[PDB]
Structures are given as C-alpha cells and as structure tokens.
Design a protein around this ligand. Structure first.
Ligand SMILES: Nc1nc2c(ncn2[C@@H]2O[C@H](COP(=O)(O)OP(=O)(O)O)[C@@H](O)[C@H]2O)c(=O)[nH]1
Length: 193
C-alpha cells in the first residue's frame, strides 16, 4: 500500500513463506520467467553468510487502472535453509498477502508446521493474526514419489481449513500462476471491500 504518485503506481507486497527448500525461489523464478521484459524490474538477491532474501517487482498484465494508477506487485521470499529469524520477520513488514509454500515430502511435514508457527509468531510482532492477512497454501512437490496426501499437509499448516489450498509442481510451472492469481485476487478483494 505505498502509493507512488510520481510513477502513478499503487504497490502491493506478496510474501512467499514456507520451510527451507520448499520451492519458493522456484515459484518466483517461474513467475519472473513469464513476465514481459518491459513490465518487470530486476530480481534482487541479498545475502550474508547466514541470511538471504530474494525479491522482484512487476506490472501485472490483467490489472486495471483505478483513477489513472497502475498496479505493481512486489514478490518477496527468504530462500534456502534459515539460521536466523530476522530475515523472515523483516520480510513480512508491510505484507499485503502471503503464499505459504508447503513441501509434500513426508520428512518435511514437521518443518511445514514449524514454518507456519514461525509465520504466526512473526505476524504477531506486527500486531497481526492469521485472519488479518490473505493467506493461500500451496502444497508444492506433488510429483514426489512419496508425496503425502494434500489433506495431511493442510492439516499441519491449516488445521481449521481457514485458507484456500492449491497444489503445485513448481519446477514445471504447474500451480504457480494459479497460486499467484488466487492470492492477488484476495489482496485486491480486501482493499476493494
Ligand atoms: N520434485 C520437486 N522438486 C522441486 C519442486 N519445486 C522446487 N523443487 C526443487 O527443490 C529444491 C528447493 O527449491 P527452492 O525453490 O530453491 O526452495 P526455497 O528454499 O523454498 O526457495 C530445488 O532443487 C528445486 O528445483 C517440485 O514441485 N517438485
């Protein structure tokens, strides 16, 4: 919700959250790869020895123009294994909607729950609960030979079925644009009404 009058843009921030290696970078890289050259900034990767953050912004093709303003989305993630919480907490500053990218691997079930607990904790620092921000779950890695049942994955990350759920194979693009359409429509929904 930072309004830029000078480029006449309204800006929305979408954070991909989830356990290390769940396919967040993959989501963002797939999306980036399909946005036309003149409608995207650079992909920015920031990294210290132990901390990381990846982000880019783009002008969605399918979004109108409330009284002369164009819509720019800013996609942010903390990719890789995490050793410190600070990047995760900071990534959430000014978030408008969240895609929780859950891993289908049975040896990642606990890390899914853990990552959802951490998201909740971090949102709580900004004074938000899980109801206060649109969240969509992507159960990624459906192509794993041991992939858990979606409903099992959802149960550890969304016990109450409060959030939409989509399946993905981010490496193949499958579920990637459906996921972003879903979160984007919930974001624009909440501003609108
Ligand atoms: N089998 C499978 N592998 C995936 C999928 N999405 C990503 N990966 C792989 O999982 C690893 C972790 O993905 P990455 O996007 O970097 O994880 P992040 O740390 O959440 O960004 C990479 O080797 C990806 O190529 C998927 O749908 N299926």
């Amino acid at each position: 919700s930072t309004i830029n009058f000078a480029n006449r843009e309204i800006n929305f921030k979408i954070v991909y959250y989830g356990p290390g290696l769940s396919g967040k970078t993959t989501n963002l890289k797939w999306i980036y790869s399909k946005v036309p050259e003149g409608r995207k900034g650079e992909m920015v990767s920031l990294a210290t020895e132990d901390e990381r953050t990846l982000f880019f912004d783009f002008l969605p093709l399918d979004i109108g123009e409330v009284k002369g303003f164009k819509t720019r989305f800013h996609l942010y993630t903390v990719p890789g294994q995490v050793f410190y919480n600070a990047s995760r907490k900071l990534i959430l500053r000014g978030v408008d909607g969240i895609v929780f990218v859950a891993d289908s691997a049975p040896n990642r079930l606990r890390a899914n729950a853990e990552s959802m607990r951490n998201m909740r904790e971090n949102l709580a620092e900004y004074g938000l609960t899980l109801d206060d921000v649109p969240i969509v779950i992507q159960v990624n890695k459906r192509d794993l030979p041991d992939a858990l049942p979606v409903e099992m994955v959802r149960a550890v990350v969304d016990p109450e079925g409060k959030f939409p759920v989509l399946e993905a194979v981010a490496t193949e693009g499958k579920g990637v644009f459906e996921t972003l359409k879903e979160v984007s429509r919930l974001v624009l929904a909440r501003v609108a009404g």
